[PDB]
Amino acid sequence: KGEELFTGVVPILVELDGDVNGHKFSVSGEGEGDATYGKLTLKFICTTGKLPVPWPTLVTTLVQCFSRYPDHMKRHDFFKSAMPEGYVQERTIFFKDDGNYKTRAEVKFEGDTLVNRIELKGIDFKEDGNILGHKLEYNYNDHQVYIMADKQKNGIKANFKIRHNIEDGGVQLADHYQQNTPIGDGPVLLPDNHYLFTTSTLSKDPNEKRDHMVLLEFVTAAGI
Structure with missing residues (x-):
């Protein structure tokens, strides 16, 4: 099972290649996920300069495999x-x-x-x-x-x-x-x-000078 791949803490890498109205940019993210609790911690950096769109608009784009599926829906x-x-x-x-x-x-x-x-x-x-x-x-x-x-x-x-x-x-x-x-x-x-x-929850790293997003996320699956 691929579910066995998520029993501990798993390192996460995110790489995004973007173009919005010709404004081109790149975003890198790294952190870790714990599917057993449904916890994600990630820091994202715009590696090309200033992000040409707002950070919140990219959240959904920047890993539902880390959602906590309770065992009565570990089959779904x-x-x-x-x-x-x-x-x-x-x-x-x-x-x-x-x-x-x-x-x-x-x-x-x-x-x-x-x-x-x-x-x-x-x-x-x-x-x-x-x-x-x-x-x-x-x-x-x-x-x-x-x-x-x-x-x-x-x-x-x-x-x-x-x-x-x-x-x-x-x-x-x-x-x-x-x-x-x-x-x-x-x-x-x-x-x-x-x-x-x-x-x-979105926050900033006080010691980071680059345009960035710290993101902390909790997620569970549920029935009905």
């Missing part, structure tokens, strides 16, 4: 079952009254490291919008994710809203559509419908 865990070969994660994220991100990621083991490697393309953004104009608060409103089996593509799908607080008022909607497909050929668990519940 598609994400771990696809390990070590991994899975592809695709999303389109529509920002209301603004542009959209399209993301393609592969999540897999490389040695003993869980790697999330991402390509992000964003188009149709307004240069003085909430995103390219950096008008979003540095905090997070999590949202449940309702995971549905997609027997047709042998993976899962989900769609959900994320709300981003706007600096001088109101809320910026980020409409997420998601599909995951295994990379390997081996068998894969296709879940009954269930929920992922996530709690994210």
